[PDB]
Amino acid sequence: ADALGMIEVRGFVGMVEAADAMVKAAKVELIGYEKTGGGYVTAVVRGDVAAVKAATEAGQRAAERVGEVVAVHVIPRPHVNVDAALPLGRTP
Amino acid sequence: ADALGMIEVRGFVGMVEAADAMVKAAKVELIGYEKTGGGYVTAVVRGDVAAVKAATEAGQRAAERVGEVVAVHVIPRPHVNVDAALPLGRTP
Amino acid sequence: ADALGMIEVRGFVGMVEAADAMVKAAKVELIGYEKTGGGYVTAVVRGDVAAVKAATEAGQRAAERVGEVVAVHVIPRPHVNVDAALPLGRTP
């Protein structure tokens, strides 16, 4: 339902620091984490777009101090097929 | 609730040596290890902030000699959403 | 819970101008005002992070014209100890 926020880190430690700084930065919900193999892990927060837009830019600032950040992006409103097909916390 | 400490090593041997040095340095609880694939393994210890802050800095010293330490980070108070979403030893 | 926003002014008139400009600028909730003595009064609004982030940046612009602004800050998530210990509006 709400907006999407992601921090992908090559490393579990940087992903946990990013997922801590996002949920301490603004009102989001850490729905989980995705393991794509090869050492890449993606932390996925989900809340309204100002909160995730502050949270992911705090988590990118906190995760580049400890590890390798691959990609940071915020979707303000993902399509219903994206929430229905990809595991992003709002599968009905 | 409890402070968090992590050692990520690209390699099982360096992670086991780090996990030995952490529990020998102070009174921490090695809850386990996360396997994100691709050669990376993350030993996770958990306790109050002085014990994990001594244990991780001893395990980094004892694990750079035997391995390739990727990331070391200490969280003194992880948020409750992080402990509920991530497998860090105290999932309710 | 809700995001926090504050305008501290050395003077009641500048605080009233800032408290008017905040609740006219965006959809926030003016809960009251804190009197720390010595002329300092702090208007406290409380709502979601985009509304308080717009309301404080308009109330600072309106309160510098009429008085003396001491400190402006927005907290997107105040901790539950802060809401339980400080009179900020959402004390249970």
Add this chain to the structure above:
Amino acid sequence: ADALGMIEVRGFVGMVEAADAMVKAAKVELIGYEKTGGGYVTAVVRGDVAAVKAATEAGQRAAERVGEVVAVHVIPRPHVNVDAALPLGRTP
């Protein structure tokens, strides 16, 4: 509701002279006064916009003789949250 007018004086005597000249110069209603500590007192008059716009500029002229005027400001439409939160004499 009704328009707002304020004279903040560092001194009780200048505030009383301002509060006398405001209610003599036009048809306003001195609802009270606010003590913010440190020597600052704010006389608050409240009436329609022409009467308060004449009354505050008469009270500023009469209060600079005996006291120290800090701030003079007229809010022609105070918002309903301001009247429901700040003590301005028309709280329902």
Add this chain to the structure above:
Amino acid sequence: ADALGMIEVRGFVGMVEAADAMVKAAKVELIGYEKTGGGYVTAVVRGDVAAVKAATEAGQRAAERVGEVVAVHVIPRPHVNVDAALPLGRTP
């Protein structure tokens, strides 16, 4: 009702000296004193206009010998809203 006289002193000693000189100068009624914080205290006499005009001009002359006098002012006919709102001793 009756005329109004005020001496504001930054200090309790000068205010007691002014409040003594005012009631010893003529027949006035010292209703009390207002404490606006920050060391400012205001002695308020209230009586007929000749007595308070002699009283405050003796209290200004006697309070500048011992302390810091902020403001001296006489109101011969204070408005009924000033008596109803401000605590000046003749509140109906």
Add this chain to the structure above:
Amino acid sequence: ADALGMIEVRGFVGMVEAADAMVKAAKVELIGYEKTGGGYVTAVVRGDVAAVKAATEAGQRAAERVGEVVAVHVIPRPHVNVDAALPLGRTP
């Protein structure tokens, strides 16, 4: 009750032009005119304070072109003794 507005012109022509410009500028009522001798004549309009404050500042601007303006002044609330003694059109 109603606000007072006056234009004094050394000359009948400038006073008639001022008294026409005042009643054409806003909803005021020209109650009359006063002949104090020596060529000085005074036109008196009377209405609410914003309308007479616009009317007299139009009548001054239209009376400096053809006459000699002596005094322009607006009284927002004349006292009842002024209307009971001076001939200002609202004598009870």
Add this chain to the structure above:
Amino acid sequence: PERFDATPPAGEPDRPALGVLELTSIARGITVADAALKRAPSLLLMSRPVSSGKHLLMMRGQVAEVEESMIAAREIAGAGSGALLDELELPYAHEQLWRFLDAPVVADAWEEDTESVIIVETATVCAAIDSADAALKTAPVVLRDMRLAIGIAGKAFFTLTGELADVEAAAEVVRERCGARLLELACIARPVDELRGRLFF
């Protein structure tokens, strides 16, 4: 559509003032509109996008309320990009000016006591309303028809009728109150019987 009347009813407060704003943009037309409605309680008559791409605001209230809304409205409009084309703040608009504001009213008949007719066109709306107000105040003329920037791309015209001396006094006051915004004025001293009353058709 009954808010454009001159006098209010017995159960309504009196609102004799008027304020017209003309803006090259429509977005900060709405920003100026709700800022002016935030500061002072002005009854907004219209917020209408008229031709040649410009937003036209008209507000109504008491004298202090319209003055305070207009000073808020002109401290919002002139914010960096000077998108305020022209403004007007009448403290008391004439009674024959109120019902020519909403719709373009055209005239179809006159009376036999109509000697002469004057047509005035200005480049803005504010100059047209200002000159019409001044000419209705200073002379016993009748405002017949008036078009305000719809269909004619920002220009605005109006015609007055009356005695020839009265409409020439109105011509003098219109040429004084416009100055540089008057495009061109015409003083028909005697219109043809094939054109009296029915000019635009």
Add this chain to the structure above:
Amino acid sequence: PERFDATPPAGEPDRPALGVLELTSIARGITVADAALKRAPSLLLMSRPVSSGKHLLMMRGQVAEVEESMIAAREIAGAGSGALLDELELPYAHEQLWRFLDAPVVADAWEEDTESVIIVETATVCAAIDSADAALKTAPVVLRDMRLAIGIAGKAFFTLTGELADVEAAAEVVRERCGARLLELACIARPVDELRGRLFF
């Protein structure tokens, strides 16, 4: 609205002529209008404000009456500032043109045998009427729809239909009766069956 007919009834005199004036001002438009109605007894078809702030005058009468009204209206218009933009004085307008002056007419359907269509747009109004009049008088074409300066800001278009050789002859006469007052002509030799009879919608 029956004064725009081609032929008058048996109780009316015949008025075949046509004079169109286009003015950059509107006050000058009515000065020109009542000057032309003072000098010669021309029936005035319209005095209409069209877009981009122009005033369009159409008058109808006999040939000498319209000629004298137009020479009066021409010597009044070019007085000082050049308010006159474009003029037209037709001694005998075509019969199909008289209903395409008052209202913007659009075509709902053609006939079953209608080969080609030509669309002409002019920068003025007099060029459109002049070119449509010449192209009707030189070729057996049918004027379908026509738009004169209202809604499209001073420009004016019209479409003729007919056989392809006839509309190419009409193109050759319109391109020389307009001159610099022609924006673009477009000779469609075969329109699509999804667009025949209905070009603007």
Add this chain to the structure above:
Amino acid sequence: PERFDATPPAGEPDRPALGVLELTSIARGITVADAALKRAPSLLLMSRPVSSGKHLLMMRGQVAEVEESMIAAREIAGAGSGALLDELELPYAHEQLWRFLDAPVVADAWEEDTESVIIVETATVCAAIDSADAALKTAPVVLRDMRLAIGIAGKAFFTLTGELADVEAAAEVVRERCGARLLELACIARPVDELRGRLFF
């Protein structure tokens, strides 16, 4: 007049695409129209002359048919006189936009839950439809009222409503998809109760 619906019924094929053409000429507007209908079977939604002398073409079809009609329109419009002012080719227009293309719609009442309003105006019609498609697709906002070049002389505006963070994300994506065609934009975070639901009147 039902061809502007979002989805067709069960007896019609689905036509989700949209092609918008804005031309400074009207003659080659019709030439571009029938060339686009000759190359690919695109259902033409409108061929309409809009103000400031422009011609607006909207066509509808599948993605390949609209792409082929638009590439025919590109090779015809930019031939000599480059009258193609701006063009749009949407592979899938949003459902809330199809009823705002034909007529100027204004809103009379929004909702009870609406927090913030944003009014956006662009110099063209293409940029208005492109911004009013790219915004509500990337934010949960409601497009309320829209105006496309008729009455405001080539400019075009639209207002969105929603949560403040959502309409600011819509503001960011509009300002990225216009850049220079955007004239102004206004982010009203809390409109007055005297103006909520009713902005143009």
